[PDB]
Design a binder for this molecule. Structure first.
Ligand SMILES: [Zn+2]
Lengths: 185, 566, 189, 90, 222
């Protein structure tokens, strides 16, 4: 219900925004799709200008709202590119006041913040999960669970007899994404 | 001759009759280089002529020497000349070396009129008028708001009797009345944009763009002349109501435009900076709270805490600030501003917003335009400086369109920087107590600092002067005396002396407040320059500003003290 | 040389606009030219201009219509195709058939921009709706063009009812690739 | 400059300029062959001067090209001046 | 055959587009250009007379704009023709000297174009002789050799692809196809293929196959 309304709001924002004569985000999405670049960069200033309620919701609980934005972006991309693709990625640009790194505290837990620093170390690419195929040890029931990176998932403990943790992952029919760890000073 | 408000259409028709043939350009518009109102007037006139398909050229001018130079440069083929922002407080006939006998072409005895090959049109608001430019020459044509018929009848009769001429006593009394009239300060009475928009309404070519330009022009006088803005405000309200379409149920569309009245506050770039910065870099707020000392900052912090807005939230940019406080701001200000004396901050102002782009108020737009005019970008240095200012004029001209938002953003940033620098300089001046007091006037002379370079453009020096006038010179139980502010420039060894007039407390309606405070600096400056010899450069259109050599500053100040004419 | 490098074997968008403006359009005059000087153009008919009555529709070239609108002496009649309902119908037609192209006028992109810029208050429908519908039509046409580029050969190609602007867009790439393929085939024989 | 051209190339340039002058002076005199290939557009435009100059007396008229002074003239009149770089179409 | 000034302008536009998009140098329409130049001169004189003497301002503005547009079209056409002459210079000389071919520069160019061709050929020959050729032996001083490793005469491309719109007659070549529509028929000799061109459609065809139709004005290049 509410999720569908938010998705529709994001879709309308993407499909209707225009500054002077060019649909910025529509053309950007088309160009990115053409070169096999599945991402969209959105300037928060435009989002605030179009409709302040959408930005209010986005800033309130980003971990819950951002995935819906990705879903809307993917739907619009499919509409624009395929005549009647992986889940796209949302990249944000902002011009809000920077919060000093040393000043981050519990007050800013689960909020969008802008800071600056110097990178001192980077790791090697990992392989996170995005779509897992699971089969039960005893009764051999096939199922799939989708995962989103944002946290506000684990293997089922109860089979959908079979004891605790009865599911194992079928790795030949799963999809993964890249991950990296950085350190900021 | 003077054209009444009802006669503007006739002058416009004369212009269209003379300089309209597609053969070649025959209209030249001269514009003051450091006047925003003149800029808006010129822009609106250019739009009108463009719609009417008339060849024209526009030439920015600064000072009086450039005016004479350019006029001598002009071609004979030119037939209509437009002056906006100047030419009202001088004897234009003598200055331009114009003898009508040469310009006369057709002399018909039956009509008793001599047609001329060039017509000079003056669009000026400064008073008093020069009778020789009003009741004298026919070549010079003046656009009058109504002052001439309102309060110049006695002087009109005196001038006519003097021209026509026991009898010695009568001639002496008439000349005495004329000298009494000519011996008074110079002050602005009206906005030129209002005159041009009255012409437009007479010809019925009004739209939202012209009304917005008129609003911009009239608002520029708010900082200096509050009486003019108050007098001309109700009409703007009526016309904004008239032109604005009532239908607004539709949500914002990309092409939507809305020019409506919203609560506007006497704050600095509220919609393009942080609330704390808006309350910090403000003339009125600082004057009321004297923020230049630590106790003022403590009072401001206490006020913000009482209003319920946190300190971190108050310093967040306006766009990204929490929307709840943005919605409830008016209620908060109403509830918690009487206590600290800032009850005059609340005001009604015009706000224009284009679809999906942030709103901008008239005051902020004017501030951005002035910042672009000021800081945007021997005799050789002087020429380079004046030509840079001329180029800045055009840099500001383009920003007045909807297709050049980048220039507007740059102007806003430059305005922020300039206000920060002026605030720092004013803090230094007030802390070090450099404002010496005298029975007649007050003196503030700058001789060192890191920002002394900026104080060569007259507009920036006037900004500093207004800043100082508001703080402790108009409030804080202080008598009203004219203030002389000067700034050195070792690169040329001269002082950009400026003679500023006092101001009554802002937002205090009273009978004395109604009467304008005339500026008497011009006549005393002229007399002192005539008596002595210090190579004073009296060429700026505003006589309040001159340039005095470094070695001759103190003698000139002593002469001014002895003058007793302020 | 006598001709610039980019104007060889193709056209420029300014020249495409020049060509498009040479077509007739309907307008509502605001003056009364008909008698109870007068136009003598040589490239275009001058009888219609000399005989115009206010508020009575007449036909004149698009270039002259824009010139009149510059002075605000006429009101341009938006073509029937531009209206919203026709745009939704054409979008549905395009969606239904994933192989053929719609039958919009050849000058459906240049005229759209010219009218949206010069005449922004003559339409009987919201401007933003028209812009969105035109954008959707253009995107679907781009998809179909991309899909159809995979069938280039050394014999010929057919693109029925394709606007002039899209043909101008695609003229260099298609022509050059087909020429190279034809050269290879000719060498093979 | 011409220092990069061999004397034969300098003669070539002179002769080709002569030829260009020759064609333009024939029956194609109504059309200025050495014109602009950008199609015509709005008849009247605003042009800003980019270089201080005197009261140059062109065939179309006398334009006092005072630096930083805008004009409102027909595009045809100031086509060549724009080409030479005195004016800007803004 | 004179019809009307508007017909002349339409023919001028058609010729301009064909020349711009064509791969070869098309024949010169002498009579049309003579008439158009005469009309331009007379119209300019009439404009001067009218301007010698505010309801008439807009008519005159339209006059001037129309004259500018016509002048631009003619100038562009002439420049395109001159460039095409420049590229195929030696080939034109070979065609003219070759008596077997009925084509003649007098039947393919105007007086200005022939003057330009002659003068440019002379100047370029002088330059190459002064710089390079004079130092070569008698076997390698001919600027137009057709027996060496690479042909020195660059001929027009006879199979360049071009966008064509099948206008149809303003005709034995017209045979109505199976889908209820008139259509022309052409043959590609290299591929032994037969192609059918239906009216009111846009194709991408070789130039040689449709050259006769373009000459007859059945089809027009886009
Ligand atoms: Zn199980």
């Amino acid at each position: 219900d509410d999720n569908t309304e938010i998705i529709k709001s994001f879709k309308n924002f993407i499909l209707e925004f225009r500054l002077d004569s060019q649909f910025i985000y529509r053309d950007q999405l088309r160009n990115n799709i053409l070169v096999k670049n599945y991402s969209l960069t959105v300037n928060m200033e435009h989002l605030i200008g179009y409709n302040e309620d959408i930005y209010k919701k986005l800033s309130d609980e980003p971990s819950d709202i951002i995935p819906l934005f990705e879903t809307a972006i993917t739907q619009v991309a499919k509409r624009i590119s395929i005549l009647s693709l992986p889940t796209f990625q949302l990249i944000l640009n902002s011009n809000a006041n920077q919060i000093p790194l040393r000043d981050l505290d519990s007050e800013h837990v689960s909020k969008i913040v802008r800071l600056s620093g110097i990178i001192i170390s980077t790791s090697v690419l990992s392989s996170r999960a995005t779509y897992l195929s699971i089969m039960c040890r005893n009764c051999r029931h096939t199922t799939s669970i989708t995962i989103n990176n944002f946290n506000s998932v684990s293997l089922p403990r109860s089979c959908l007899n079979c004891g605790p943790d009865p599911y194992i992952i079928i790795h030949e029919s799963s999809k993964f994404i890249d991950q990296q760890f950085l350190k900021l000073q | 001759m003077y054209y009444g408000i009802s006669q503007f259409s006739e002058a416009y028709n004369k212009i269209l009759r003379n300089s309209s043939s597609h053969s070649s350009c025959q209209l030249v518009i001269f514009v003051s280089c450091l006047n925003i109102d003149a800029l808006c007037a010129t822009k609106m006139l250019s739009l009108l002529f463009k719609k009417q398909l008339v060849q024209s050229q526009i030439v920015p001018i600064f000072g009086y020497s450039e005016l004479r130079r350019h006029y001598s440069q002009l071609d004979d083929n030119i037939n209509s000349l437009l002056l906006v922002g100047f030419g009202g407080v001088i004897d234009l006939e003598a200055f331009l070396e114009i003898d009508p006998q040469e310009y006369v072409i057709d002399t018909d005895e039956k009509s008793g009129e001599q047609s001329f090959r060039r017509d000079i049109y003056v669009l000026d608001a400064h008073r008093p008028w020069n009778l020789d430019n009003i009741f004298g020459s026919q070549i010079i044509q003046c656009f009058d708001d109504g002052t001439v018929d309102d309060t110049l009848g006695e002087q009109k009769e005196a001038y006519y009797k003097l021209l026509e001429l026991q009898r010695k006593k009568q001639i002496h009394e008439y000349e005495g009345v004329l000298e009494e009239y000519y011996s008074q300060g110079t002050t602005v009475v009206n906005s030129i944009s209002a005159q041009i928009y009255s012409l437009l309404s007479a010809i019925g070519e009004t739209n939202l763009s012209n009304l917005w330009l008129n609003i911009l022009g009239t608002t520029s006088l708010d900082i200096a002349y509050a009486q003019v803005y108050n007098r001309l405000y109700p009409l703007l309200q009526d016309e904004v109501k008239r032109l604005t379409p009532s239908s607004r149920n539709s949500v914002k569309t990309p092409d939507t435009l809305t020019l409506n009245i919203q609560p506007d506050y006497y704050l600095f770039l509220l919609r393009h900076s942080s609330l704390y910065d808006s309350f910090y870099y403000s003339n009125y707020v600082n004057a009321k709270l004297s923020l230049w000392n630590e106790n003022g900052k403590k009072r401001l912090h206490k006020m913000f805490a009482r209003m319920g807005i946190p300190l971190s939230t108050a310093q967040e940019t306006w766009l990204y600030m929490d929307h709840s406080i943005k919605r409830e701001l008016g209620i908060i200000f109403d509830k918690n501003l009487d206590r600290y004396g800032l009850q005059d901050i609340i005001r009604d102002g015009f706000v224009r917003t284009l679809g999906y782009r942030g709103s901008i108020s008239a005051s902020e737009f004017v501030e951005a335009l002035t910042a672009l005019l000021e800081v945007g970008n021997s005799a050789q240095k002087l020429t380079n400086l004046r030509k840079r200012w001329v180029s800045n004029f055009w840099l500001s001209w383009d920003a007045l369109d909807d297709r050049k938002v980048e220039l507007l953003n740059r102007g806003i940033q430059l305005a922020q920087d300039l206000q920060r620098a002026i605030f720092n300089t004013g803090v230094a001046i007030l802390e070090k107590k450099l404002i010496k007091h005298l029975r007649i006037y007050r003196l503030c002379v700058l001789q060192d600092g890191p920002d002394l370079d900026l104080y060569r453009n007259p507009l920036t020096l006037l900004r500093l002067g207004n800043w100082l006038i508001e703080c402790c010179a108009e409030s804080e139980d202080k008598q009203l005396l004219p203030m002389v502010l000067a700034s050195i420039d070792e690169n040329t060894d001269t002082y950009l002396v400026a003679g500023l007039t006092p101001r009554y407390p802002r937002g205090l309606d009273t009978i004395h407040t109604k009467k304008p405070i005339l500026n008497n600096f011009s006549m005393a400056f002229q007399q002192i320059t005539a008596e002595t010899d210090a190579k004073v450069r009296i060429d700026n259109f505003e006589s309040s500003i001159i340039e005095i050599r470094r070695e001759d500053l103190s003698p000139f100040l002593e002469k001014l003290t002895l003058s007793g004419l302020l | 040389m006598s001709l610039p490098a980019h104007l060889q074997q193709t056209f420029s968008p300014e020249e495409i606009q020049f060509i498009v403006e040479n077509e007739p359009i309907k307008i509502f005059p605001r003056i009364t030219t008909r008698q109870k000087t007068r136009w003598q153009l040589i490239t275009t008919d001058d009888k219609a201009l000399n005989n115009m009555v206010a508020m009575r529709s007449t036909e004149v070239v698009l270039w002259i219509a824009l010139l009149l609108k510059q002075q605000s002496k006429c009101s341009i009649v938006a073509p029937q195709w531009l209206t919203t309902k026709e745009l939704d119908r054409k979008i549905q037609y395009e969606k239904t058939h994933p192989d053929r192209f719609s039958e919009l006028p050849w000058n459906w992109l240049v005229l759209a921009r010219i009218l949206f810029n010069k005449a922004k208050d003559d339409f009987h429908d919201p401007i933003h709706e028209l812009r969105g519908k035109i954008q959707d039509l253009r995107e679907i046409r781009q998809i179909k063009v991309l899909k159809g580029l995979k069938y280039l050969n050394e014999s010929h190609l057919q693109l029925d009812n394709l606007s002039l602007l899209e043909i101008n867009e695609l003229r260099p790439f298609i022509t050059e690739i087909m020429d190279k393929l034809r050269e290879i085939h000719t060498a093979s024989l | 400059d011409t220092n990069n051209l061999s004397h034969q190339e300098q003669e070539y340039l002179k002769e080709y300029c002569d030829l260009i002058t020759d064609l333009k002076s024939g029956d194609l005199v109504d059309i200025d062959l050495s014109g602009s290939l950008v199609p015509p557009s709005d008849v009247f435009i605003d042009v800003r001067v980019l270089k201080d100059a005197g009261e140059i007396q062109t065939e179309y008229g006398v334009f006092n090209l005072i630096k930083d002074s805008q004009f409102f003239v027909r595009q045809s009149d100031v086509e060549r001046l724009i080409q030479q770089g005195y004016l800007q179409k803004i | 055959i004179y019809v009307s000034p508007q017909q002349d302008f339409s023919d001028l536009m058609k010729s301009w587009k064909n020349e711009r998009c064509s791969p070869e140098l098309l024949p010169y329409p002498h009579q049309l250009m003579k008439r158009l130049l005469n009309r331009i001169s007379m119209q300019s004189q009439l404009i001067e007379n009218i301007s010698m003497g505010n309801e008439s301002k807009l008519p005159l503005l339209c006059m001037e704009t129309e004259l500018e547009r016509l002048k631009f079209v003619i100038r562009s056409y002439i420049r395109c023709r001159l460039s095409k002459i420049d590229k195929f210079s030696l080939y034109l000389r070979q065609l003219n000297e070759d008596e077997n071919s009925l084509i003649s520069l007098t039947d393919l160019l105007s007086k200005d174009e022939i003057k330009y061709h002659d003068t440019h050929s002379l100047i370029w020959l002088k330059l190459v002789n002064d710089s390079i050729l004079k130092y070569m032996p008698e076997e390698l001083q001919a600027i137009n050799d057709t027996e060496g490793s690479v042909n020195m005469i660059d001929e027009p491309d006879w199979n360049k692809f071009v966008f064509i719109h099948v206008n149809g007659p303003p005709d034995p070549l017209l045979q109505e196809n199976e889908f209820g529509k008139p259509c022309y028929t052409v043959t590609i000799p290299d591929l032994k293929e037969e192609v059918e061109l239906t009216i009111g459609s846009i194709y991408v065809m070789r130039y040689e196959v449709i050259r006769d139709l373009l000459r007859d004005d059945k089809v027009a290049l886009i």
